[PDB]
Symmetry: C2
Subunit: 328 residues, 2 copies
Amino acid sequence: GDLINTVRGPIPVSEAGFTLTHEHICGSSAGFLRAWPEFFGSRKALAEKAVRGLRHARAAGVQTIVDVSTFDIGRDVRLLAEVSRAADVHIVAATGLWFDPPLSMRMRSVEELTQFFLREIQHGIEDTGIRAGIIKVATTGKATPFQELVLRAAARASLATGVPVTTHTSASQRGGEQQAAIFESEGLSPSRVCIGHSDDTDDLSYLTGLAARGYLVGLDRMPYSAIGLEGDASALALFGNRSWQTRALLIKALIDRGYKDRILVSHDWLFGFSSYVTNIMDVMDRINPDGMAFVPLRVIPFLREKGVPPETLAGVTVANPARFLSPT
Amino acid sequence: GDLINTVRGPIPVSEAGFTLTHEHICGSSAGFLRAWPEFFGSRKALAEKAVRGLRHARAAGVQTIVDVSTFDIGRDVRLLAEVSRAADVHIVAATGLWFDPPLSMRMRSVEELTQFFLREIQHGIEDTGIRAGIIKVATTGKATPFQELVLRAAARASLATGVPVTTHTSASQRGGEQQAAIFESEGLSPSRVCIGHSDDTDDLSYLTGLAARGYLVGLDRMPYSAIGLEGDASALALFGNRSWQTRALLIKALIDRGYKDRILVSHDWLFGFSSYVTNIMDVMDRINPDGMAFVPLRVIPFLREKGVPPETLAGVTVANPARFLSPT
Ligand SMILES: [Co+2]
Ligand SMILES: [Co+2]
Ligand SMILES: [Co+2]
Ligand SMILES: [Co+2]
């Protein structure tokens, strides 16, 4: 009976199935794929790449992704609808604002940003009628004044609609703690919030402190590792130096500590990427040729071999996304 | 025989007539009018406002404007084409980058930015086939590293196409001097470059130094004055404290010094403005209800009353734009 909005229209909650909760078709900037599609070879090439990659994920058991691209990540909801149809994978679109708002967003009040986020959830994105099913926000450590307005507008849009909030943060700066403080000052329930990029640290005091408070903890960059590429400074800065198995052990660490219901797993993958260095796709595709099938192909069996029960893994990959995405 | 690209297609140089060389339909951000047109009431309201204002300018004798909105000013070339048709005023569109490039532009090399600017001049903007007729760039004082790449890519696109380059600068910081240094290091002729916002200062050593070197000097913010509003800090910061008559005396100062062929006059007006404080249109429309008719209605007669000959004023408003816009 409960429903989630996707770029193809409403679906029953129970059909979302195995869901990757932090992904992107294309990491770009507002207006960019319309103005310069040849950056990606062509729009058609980008769409075909994305359809191949979603088909691969689907073969591996993924049924839904949440594309957390905001306005300022260059979200193109028509592209999402096209590739969702072609690949037969559900895609949930996002509203919110990430790190790159333009001036026309940076000048706005909390009330104005609230109406923008509500427009995209309740009315539709652009002129398409496609409704966002999640609100994405971002900080590093200490929230800037504008980021604090974004977080408050996200909380107010979530309270009005039931749609959840998901975050980018700097895990090494324990950024989720200030996010949580702002959301709670707005009366937002922690059960509506995922603190993302939490696998970028092994700081289990930070992670268990959020989980104990009821937050979802997004272990969402599973394939990110610059091991083997450490002379590529741009790769190292984005990916890192920890292995995927190190990241995946955090899923088991939280389950072992009683927090299985508080975990969301994903890749933070993409099929095009213009907001970083030229050719970064190419580096990424070498680190992780499986793309968005890496979680079911590598991470889930690794955890099953370490003794995590199948029921617990189904709860993390199916039940927890369903409860998070259901408007509540 | 010479031709200029407009948003309606090619026109003869000689039909551009009285031309305002630095204007905007809407000062916004990439993607913004598509994502949040209700910020402006509606897209239809914005277009109707712009058509009324261009009709008023046309009645006052304006035949062409150059809309120097770049990608990151939220240029919407379909909007420009619509309002140009409805108002029967030619509009030249721009490529280049202003102060608000997103990450997908800020990561690019000089070679990449060159191909983007060339795309918009030679192929067309977005999927529209509408060709830019000018390249807009921006700095304040000292160019940032990325701004220097923008200026070099603009110079290289101009050398390949003949299209001119026009600038935003901080006149109080004499920013045109560093712009000129970069353009000349690229081999760009000063005759292809307008150093804009030059009426924001009364520093005639700065202005005559550029004019002597062959630059066009853009006296382009004629109606900008916060006199009467000086308690509105945002108005003061953008407009200022000098009167329009003070700004217009710079046109006569340069003519009196022998630089009549080096002057371009405009308003830097707009019909919508989302990249600044909410309601700024409203403040602007009170300072200058004549909009883009203020130059022919107020500035030209003021100069004629101070004894500038009609032939000289025709040369500034017709001949100088034609020579500047003609690809050369
Ligand atoms: Co992120
Ligand atoms: Co992401
Ligand atoms: Co400017
Ligand atoms: Co301007």
